[PDB]
Design an enzyme around this catalytic site. Sequence first.
Site, PDB file in Angstrom:
ATOM      1  N   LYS A  13      -7.557   3.563  11.543  1.00 24.25           N
ATOM      2  CA  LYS A  13      -6.452   2.811  10.914  1.00 24.25           C
ATOM      3  C   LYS A  13      -5.881   1.617  11.692  1.00 24.25           C
ATOM      4  CE  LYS A  13      -3.932   4.723   7.851  1.00 24.25           C
ATOM      5  NZ  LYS A  13      -2.792   5.499   7.298  1.00 24.25           N
TER       6      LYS A  13
ATOM      7  N   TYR B 207       2.147  -3.558  -1.743  1.00 23.83           N
ATOM      8  CA  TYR B 207       1.511  -2.260  -1.589  1.00 23.83           C
ATOM      9  C   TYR B 207       2.404  -1.221  -2.280  1.00 23.83           C
ATOM     10  CZ  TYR B 207       0.750   2.331   0.483  1.00 23.83           C
ATOM     11  OH  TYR B 207       0.595   3.691   0.656  1.00 23.83           O
TER      12      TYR B 207
ATOM     13  N   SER C 280       3.285   7.183  -2.584  1.00 23.58           N
ATOM     14  CA  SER C 280       3.764   6.772  -1.259  1.00 23.58           C
ATOM     15  C   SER C 280       5.285   6.697  -1.204  1.00 23.58           C
ATOM     16  CB  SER C 280       3.202   5.391  -0.929  1.00 23.58           C
ATOM     17  OG  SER C 280       3.781   4.885   0.259  1.00 23.58           O
TER      18      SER C 280
HETATM   19  N1  LIG Z   1       0.999   7.872   6.433  1.00 20.50           N
HETATM   20  C1  LIG Z   1      -0.044   7.759   5.546  1.00 20.50           C
HETATM   21  O1  LIG Z   1      -1.225   7.891   5.824  1.00 20.50           O
HETATM   22  C2  LIG Z   1       0.341   7.459   4.049  1.00 20.50           C
HETATM   23  C3  LIG Z   1       1.742   7.297   3.748  1.00 20.50           C
HETATM   24  C4  LIG Z   1       1.957   7.044   2.357  1.00 20.50           C
HETATM   25  C5  LIG Z   1       1.001   6.955   1.390  1.00 20.50           C
HETATM   26  N2  LIG Z   1      -0.334   7.121   1.765  1.00 20.50           N
HETATM   27  C6  LIG Z   1      -1.445   7.044   0.746  1.00 20.50           C
HETATM   28  O2  LIG Z   1      -2.362   8.075   1.038  1.00 20.50           O
HETATM   29  C7  LIG Z   1      -3.692   7.708   0.637  1.00 20.50           C
HETATM   30  C8  LIG Z   1      -4.600   7.930   1.851  1.00 20.50           C
HETATM   31  O3  LIG Z   1      -3.951   7.212   2.915  1.00 20.50           O
HETATM   32  P1  LIG Z   1      -4.715   7.208   4.368  1.00 20.50           P
HETATM   33  O4  LIG Z   1      -3.678   7.116   5.418  1.00 20.50           O
HETATM   34  O5  LIG Z   1      -5.530   8.446   4.394  1.00 20.50           O
HETATM   35  O6  LIG Z   1      -5.614   5.915   4.365  1.00 20.50           O
HETATM   36  P2  LIG Z   1      -6.989   5.411   4.792  1.00 20.50           P
HETATM   37  O7  LIG Z   1      -7.406   6.064   6.072  1.00 20.50           O
HETATM   38  O8  LIG Z   1      -7.050   3.911   4.878  1.00 20.50           O
HETATM   39  O9  LIG Z   1      -7.989   6.003   3.624  1.00 20.50           O
HETATM   40  C9  LIG Z   1      -8.187   5.266   2.357  1.00 20.50           C
HETATM   41  C10 LIG Z   1      -9.721   5.015   2.354  1.00 20.50           C
HETATM   42  O10 LIG Z   1     -10.161   4.667   1.050  1.00 20.50           O
HETATM   43  C11 LIG Z   1     -10.876   3.428   1.093  1.00 20.50           C
HETATM   44  N3  LIG Z   1     -10.549   2.896  -0.193  1.00 20.50           N
HETATM   45  C12 LIG Z   1      -9.743   1.822  -0.509  1.00 20.50           C
HETATM   46  N4  LIG Z   1      -9.631   1.625  -1.811  1.00 20.50           N
HETATM   47  C13 LIG Z   1     -10.413   2.627  -2.350  1.00 20.50           C
HETATM   48  C14 LIG Z   1     -10.702   2.970  -3.716  1.00 20.50           C
HETATM   49  N5  LIG Z   1     -10.156   2.252  -4.711  1.00 20.50           N
HETATM   50  N6  LIG Z   1     -11.540   4.055  -3.932  1.00 20.50           N
HETATM   51  C15 LIG Z   1     -12.052   4.739  -2.828  1.00 20.50           C
HETATM   52  N7  LIG Z   1     -11.832   4.488  -1.542  1.00 20.50           N
HETATM   53  C16 LIG Z   1     -10.994   3.411  -1.379  1.00 20.50           C
HETATM   54  C17 LIG Z   1     -10.288   2.671   2.241  1.00 20.50           C
HETATM   55  O11 LIG Z   1     -11.140   1.621   2.605  1.00 20.50           O
HETATM   56  P3  LIG Z   1     -10.657  -0.026   2.332  1.00 20.50           P
HETATM   57  O12 LIG Z   1      -9.160   0.105   2.208  1.00 20.50           O
HETATM   58  O13 LIG Z   1     -11.111  -0.618   3.614  1.00 20.50           O
HETATM   59  O14 LIG Z   1     -11.368  -0.477   1.147  1.00 20.50           O
HETATM   60  C18 LIG Z   1     -10.115   3.860   3.283  1.00 20.50           C
HETATM   61  O15 LIG Z   1     -11.255   4.274   3.978  1.00 20.50           O
HETATM   62  C19 LIG Z   1      -3.652   6.223   0.186  1.00 20.50           C
HETATM   63  O16 LIG Z   1      -3.706   6.168  -1.241  1.00 20.50           O
HETATM   64  C20 LIG Z   1      -2.295   5.759   0.812  1.00 20.50           C
HETATM   65  O17 LIG Z   1      -1.741   4.690   0.030  1.00 20.50           O
HETATM   66  C21 LIG Z   1      -0.714   7.379   3.116  1.00 20.50           C
END
Ligand SMILES: NC(=O)c1ccc[n+]([C@@H]2O[C@H](COP(=O)([O-])OP(=O)(O)OC[C@H]3O[C@@H](n4cnc5c(N)ncnc54)[C@H](OP(=O)(O)O)[C@@H]3O)[C@@H](O)[C@H]2O)c1
Lengths: 307, 272, 300, 273, 300
Positions: free
Chosen positions: B178, B140, B116
């Site tokens: 989200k 985070y 991230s």
């Molecule tokens: N703009 C962005 O989207 C952004 C920017 C920077 C970094 N990231 C990183 O990109 C990745 C995906 O982000 P996203 O935006 O797609 O988020 P997201 O929609 O919240 O997807 C993450 C999913 O994984 C679930 N989850 C949580 N912990 C988990 C685990 N240990 N194993 C499996 N599933 C798990 C979550 O549910 P619960 O959390 O409810 O358990 C959620 O459904 C994450 O690692 C995030 O930190 C995203």
Amino acid sequence: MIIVTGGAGFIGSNIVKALNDKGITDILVVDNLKDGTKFVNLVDLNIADYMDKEDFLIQIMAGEEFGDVEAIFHEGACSSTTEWDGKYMMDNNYQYSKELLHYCLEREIPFLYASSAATYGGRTSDFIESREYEKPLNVYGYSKFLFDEYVRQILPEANSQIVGFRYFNVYGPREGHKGSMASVAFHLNTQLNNGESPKLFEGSENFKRDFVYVGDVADVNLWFLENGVSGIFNLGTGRAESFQAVADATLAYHKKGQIEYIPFPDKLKGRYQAFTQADLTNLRAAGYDKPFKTVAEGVTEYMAWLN
Amino acid sequence: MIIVTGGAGFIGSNIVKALNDKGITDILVVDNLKDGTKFVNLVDLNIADYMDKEDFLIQIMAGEEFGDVEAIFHEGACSSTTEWDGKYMMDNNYQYSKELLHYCLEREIPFLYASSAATYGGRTSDFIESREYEKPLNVYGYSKFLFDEYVRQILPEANSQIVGFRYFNVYGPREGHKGSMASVAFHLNTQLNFKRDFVYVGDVADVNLWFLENGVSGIFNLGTGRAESFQAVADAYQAFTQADLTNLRAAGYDKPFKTVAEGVTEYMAWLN
Amino acid sequence: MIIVTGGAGFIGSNIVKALNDKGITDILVVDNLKDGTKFVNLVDLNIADYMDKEDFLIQIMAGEEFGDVEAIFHEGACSSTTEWDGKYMMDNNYQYSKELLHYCLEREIPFLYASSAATYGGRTSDFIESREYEKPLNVYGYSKFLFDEYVRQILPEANSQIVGFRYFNVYGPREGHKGSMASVAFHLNTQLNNGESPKLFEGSENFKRDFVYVGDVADVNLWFLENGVSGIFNLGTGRAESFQAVADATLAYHKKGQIEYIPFYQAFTQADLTNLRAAGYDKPFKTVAEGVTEYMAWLN
Amino acid sequence: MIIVTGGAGFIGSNIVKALNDKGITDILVVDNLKDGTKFVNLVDLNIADYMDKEDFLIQIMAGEEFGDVEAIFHEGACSSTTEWDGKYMMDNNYQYSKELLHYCLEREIPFLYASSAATYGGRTSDFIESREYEKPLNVYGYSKFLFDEYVRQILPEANSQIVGFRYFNVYGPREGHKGSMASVAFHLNTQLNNKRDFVYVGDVADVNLWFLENGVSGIFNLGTGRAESFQAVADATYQAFTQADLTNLRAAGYDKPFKTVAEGVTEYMAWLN
Amino acid sequence: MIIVTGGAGFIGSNIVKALNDKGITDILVVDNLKDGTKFVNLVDLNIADYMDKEDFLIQIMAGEEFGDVEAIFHEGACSSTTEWDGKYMMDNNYQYSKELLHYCLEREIPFLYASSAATYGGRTSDFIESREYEKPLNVYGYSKFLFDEYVRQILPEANSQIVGFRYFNVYGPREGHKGSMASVAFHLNTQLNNGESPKLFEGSENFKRDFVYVGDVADVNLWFLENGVSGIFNLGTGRAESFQAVADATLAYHKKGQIEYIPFYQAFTQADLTNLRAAGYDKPFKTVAEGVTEYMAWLN
Ligand SMILES: NC(=O)c1ccc[n+]([C@@H]2O[C@H](COP(=O)([O-])OP(=O)(O)OC[C@H]3O[C@@H](n4cnc5c(N)ncnc54)[C@H](OP(=O)(O)O)[C@@H]3O)[C@@H](O)[C@H]2O)c1
Ligand SMILES: NC(=O)c1ccc[n+]([C@@H]2O[C@H](COP(=O)([O-])OP(=O)(O)OC[C@H]3O[C@@H](n4cnc5c(N)ncnc54)[C@H](OP(=O)(O)O)[C@@H]3O)[C@@H](O)[C@H]2O)c1
Ligand SMILES: NC(=O)c1ccc[n+]([C@@H]2O[C@H](COP(=O)([O-])OP(=O)(O)OC[C@H]3O[C@@H](n4cnc5c(N)ncnc54)[C@H](OP(=O)(O)O)[C@@H]3O)[C@@H](O)[C@H]2O)c1
Ligand SMILES: NC(=O)c1ccc[n+]([C@@H]2O[C@H](COP(=O)([O-])OP(=O)(O)OC[C@H]3O[C@@H](n4cnc5c(N)ncnc54)[C@H](OP(=O)(O)O)[C@@H]3O)[C@@H](O)[C@H]2O)c1
Ligand SMILES: NC(=O)c1ccc[n+]([C@@H]2O[C@H](COP(=O)([O-])OP(=O)(O)OC[C@H]3O[C@@H](n4cnc5c(N)ncnc54)[C@H](OP(=O)(O)O)[C@@H]3O)[C@@H](O)[C@H]2O)c1
Ligand SMILES: Nc1ncnc2c1ncn2[C@@H]1O[C@H](COP(=O)(O)OP(=O)(O)O[C@H]2O[C@H](CO)[C@@H](O)[C@H](O)[C@H]2O)[C@@H](O)[C@H]1O
Ligand SMILES: Nc1ncnc2c1ncn2[C@@H]1O[C@H](COP(=O)(O)OP(=O)(O)O[C@H]2O[C@H](CO)[C@@H](O)[C@H](O)[C@H]2O)[C@@H](O)[C@H]1O
């Protein structure tokens, strides 16, 4: 590697920083990050791994190995003098400590832990590391007292280093997460920065403590690891200053301020140490040849850092 | 088969879609469906099986085999910057990723995870993938930063692919679940009904599959390399972000990224 | 012995009844009786034993034997289209079904389960059992859809029977515990008996569904067990009738009432039975008029 | 020793008292004392030991031995007709009883348990111990009914005694803890101090010991065979109409008479003072 | 090593103190410190280790060894007469005690426990250690009573010491944590120190109990350990004194105070010490005047 329990906490994170300053970065931090704001204590530092205190205990008791462990600085403990759950206190502080002590004894890994000046109880002089001088005023103090007693039983036949440090009133960088348990100096700085009135309990000119700067606390810790001496040593400056002195030094730095006296807390009545002063005879006799910053010196350095 | 953790989430479901587009359907999705509304991210897609994140970790730790695993895209994590329970944060994010990493290392299964840009903290320039440029402002960000440091210790002697992508401000299809953490573009759209490096999910998915196909290891910034204002997004705490793509391009990824203007209009033409 | 999961529920208890009606009483009912009122679906029946769904799963997973199991009719599931805890939904419906499926495959025990027409989501026409026609609208529909996709992967090399039935709008005896989820025929009956107005949504004519009688649902289930055919099949009459037609048949038995049309969704469902008939099932299905009069007779 | 589950309860403590009256004190009482006031039902009695119902089940299922067990009077159960958690009801009543039954069958220990007239639901006549006469109105009645059906499957090949008693409206000493569920006679007595088949507990306890001494197996109604009005109970101090059919009870050999409401209630009012 | 359960409590901490006075410091205290203020009962004493009552039970039941255990003083129990959760009472008191008794019997470790005069219930005379004299008025009394009955069954063939002491109205240092359950003497002292009035029930001139000083309670405990005699014995002074006498001694000490008789059981208790003396315990017991004044000097 070196393991620092309580590594995301006040004293623990300062030990990690002191290790970093000496070129050591292979460090396992064990803590409880429920209060996630503690992570700032670790952001600018370099460590190898992080583990929660509950998982660590499970592994310790299961006899797991964590690698080439050269020492364990056990700073982790519930430090609130106002926490009255004795079941939790004895479990988290006393029992957790015995568990670690045995783990290290079996593997001959140096064990350096945190004791507390709270063990002395209502004393007015003679803060000497001996049972006759000990009588805590709260369970927190009792949990610390009882583990020192346990260590005194073990010392006679231990084949590896065991050192406990009775910290007095530690203050300095990285205690912002401590809330009401943070030092008075920290409190005064936030009060003045929020425009509020700087506060002290009624009776503070007669309330004295041996305030020690964390930087010095970290230094004693590393010196003992380098020198291998065992025992229970007081860690303070050896001079008691009033809370008023702490305020004076802080309000001098701020160029503003009028101390307001608050009524003494009821929960502290009968549980409070009105005077503490470390007796450094044993510390010096162990060979510790370094000086300690005064409240004026330490408080001005801390205030410059806080701002 | 390919395992996509966070597969019912934003970036993860987009990776499943990209895989579907390349004729791949033998996919195991690992997620947490407590918020059942996320099932929509998966409805129109084709996967082989679904498993809860807690059950999956138990099996991973038990050393269970899941079949012929070709890769794991580890997108699952608690992505909320406002979540302050660091015990849960370090467990769900940091510890969970180490567990998966080791499982993959032992079996030489390619491991592509999500980092991230929050690792950079209050930074104003020089968003380069190196420890001296990192200083997160929240737990985070810390859980993400610490895992990157852990991977850096592991990289020197790894015998299989390890790649972490530092995503910047991702936006696009499949983020409706989200809530407050959804993109500003999504918020503006539902409302009507500081500069950041805004990247379209489509491009994020493409970079992911490109690295799987090319086998390169490392930690790479994933953004457009251009910082645009929130105002620009509207027209279509870190105060300014802009990815430095020197390492990404040096790894061989030379393809262009959609601008806020191109990506946001394609996104609105989907949301409607 | 035959195991019926969801046996204290609507469709499951009707399968137990149908088994009884042929003299079969060696039955293990698996359910969740937290809502104790469901016991009435079982009072007049004859079974061998009762087990809670949690204990059953623990025993299944441990590989325990239950005796001479000739079949498992898996009707047990969370059927609320308003239940949005997907972690529970995917566990209780999807994962639980996989567990049972594998248990039966290893022992070559016939496995007949419940799918749902909710898998078709907002579909208007062409209700055919193929992935292109499926797009559920809620997590409940998704848990059913995904299990069918899982069974499709397993079908090619299975050595024992695997049958899933996509039930449409089932109505009939033993659905009283369903509350607002009970059939409109049940609701109308309650109203007429309570002395209130039998109510239908405005423009209930032109609102059609494939209403199937539970008795026919139970028969299809027993026929498949007897014939051993595998696959996923639509279970409906193949004829869509209006909610108005259901009300007509209700008042025709009650000999009373005047329908009141309340204020304010699938305006149409009709099962395509090409695959069902091609599999060999050729019995007719009761019409709304036939099924509803029989139902009302039981209710009263 | 004799094990009495439900021993701190109404009928159970009365069985312990009846055993005491015959010189038996090597008794293990199994109950749930969450309501600590139930201890009074046992203060004046003589038992050997006490065990919580949860611990007892764990040991039963683990196949532990409790000594030289000569019988188990299983009176323990949730007897609230207004309790609608069927998961708890089927577990605590139905499942718990099966677990005990099998334990005893394997060790050939006599098993005498409590059934209920609630199995007849809203019946008006012909209260006979046969499935065609049973149709409970609540889950409580259902948990009882289903265990009787389970016992009927087991009976044909059992090598030791199995007896179930369909108690009708029991009233008498040691029911004070039952609150709203206590007999009408009990209620009337408390108030003044500020048609169904009513049977006196003393008789219930007697029938229980009689069967243990005689070893007969089966499911039997336990009532007086005569229905009296609540008005009658009052004068002396949802199933409408109940009256036990004692054909099978007499046929098993129990010839002894049953106290009438007037007899039982005046004796009861006497003890309550 | 000597184990004292209930060691951070009133009687238990006084036993630890008595052990210290005889040179014994190798002591394991087992208690429940959730009420952390109980730590004071231990600050000035010397013990070897501390363990929570739950962890101790698990280890006892697992058959763990604690070292060279030469005796177990089982004072730990829920002592509330107003506590009505009988599941907990019977578990924490009755069952916990059996668990410990068996562990000791197996290893032939002397077992000295705490019974209670509450086993006599509402008795007015003849407080003799036999079943005909016992009839508790609450579950607390019943849990104590039942354990005594259990011990009576075990005594005939025991190969090691088993002694139970039916304590009467104990009072003295280290009961401050008991709150409302602490002795009247304690209460009166806190009131005279709150500048306010000492409250005594109206009619206290005729409310008599066998009040025993804890110091004497601890002495009996150590004497029995030293002498190895088994049995169940009354532990009181054998003399009943009024609550008024308790008050007289308090105010005599404070050189001030006026008693306010507030509005408002067991109106009479007196231990029969025949069995106690016959066992060989011949020491005298402090009177209320002697014990209460000594208690005041300590409290101040
Ligand atoms: N703009 C962005 O989207 C952004 C920017 C920077 C970094 N990231 C990183 O990109 C990745 C995906 O982000 P996203 O935006 O797609 O988020 P997201 O929609 O919240 O997807 C993450 C999913 O994984 C679930 N989850 C949580 N912990 C988990 C685990 N240990 N194993 C499996 N599933 C798990 C979550 O549910 P619960 O959390 O409810 O358990 C959620 O459904 C994450 O690692 C995030 O930190 C995203
Ligand atoms: N002035 C002083 O700071 C002072 C004076 C005398 C003695 N001491 C002793 O010095 C040590 C550190 O004090 P501090 O001021 O640095 O405290 P701190 O800021 O509270 O740091 C201790 C950290 O350890 C965690 N922790 C608690 N129990 C633990 C365990 N068993 N294992 C690992 N981590 C655990 C705490 O989280 P949770 O508490 O939320 O679990 C906290 O983050 C303690 O042993 C304290 O008693 C400090
Ligand atoms: N028109 C229709 O009735 C219709 C239409 C489409 C699909 N279906 C499907 O048909 C099947 C039966 O439907 P129904 O109307 O008869 O439903 P129902 O009345 O809700 O009966 C199902 C019963 O099974 C219980 N149960 C839930 N999960 C279970 C499990 N994993 N194992 C065993 N029992 C479980 C439920 O209790 P809890 O839920 O309280 O745990 C309930 O008592 C379901 O699988 C449903 O999805 C029915
Ligand atoms: N008129 C009547 O009294 C009548 C009529 C028909 C049938 N019966 C049956 O007669 C038996 C005794 O009835 P009662 O009136 O004497 O009842 P009661 O006063 O409630 O006594 C039953 C006791 O057993 C306890 N218990 C519950 N489940 C248990 C288990 N699985 N094992 C051991 N103890 C358990 C109960 O505690 P919790 O319930 O609080 O756990 C209660 O203290 C019951 O089986 C009842 O259903 C009585
Ligand atoms: N006037 C009297 O003192 C008197 C009169 C008659 C009988 N007794 C008996 O004397 C003994 C000591 O009484 P006390 O006045 O000294 O009481 P106390 O101050 O309350 O000491 C008992 C201590 O043991 C703890 N405890 C409870 N159950 C325990 C167990 N199973 N194992 C270990 N510790 C346990 C209690 O904590 P929690 O209860 O909070 O868990 C409490 O701290 C008790 O057995 C009491 O029944 C005393
Ligand atoms: N005179 C005064 N005027 C105004 N405020 C006052 C005051 N005296 C105390 N306070 C404040 O109120 C709290 C009460 O503290 P205590 O006196 O009980 O413990 P202590 O000061 O030894 O704390 C210390 O000891 C424990 C461990 O021994 C650590 O956990 C803790 O951070 C450390 O400050 C303090 O943390 C302080 O913030
Ligand atoms: N015309 C009318 N007049 C009065 N009351 C009415 C009515 N229509 C519905 N209602 C009542 O109000 C609710 C409306 O819900 P839906 O019609 O969407 O659910 P239903 O269970 O009938 O069908 C779901 O299940 C079936 C089969 O599983 C699918 O075919 C379908 O698309 C899916 O929505 C129902 O619970 C019903 O009792």
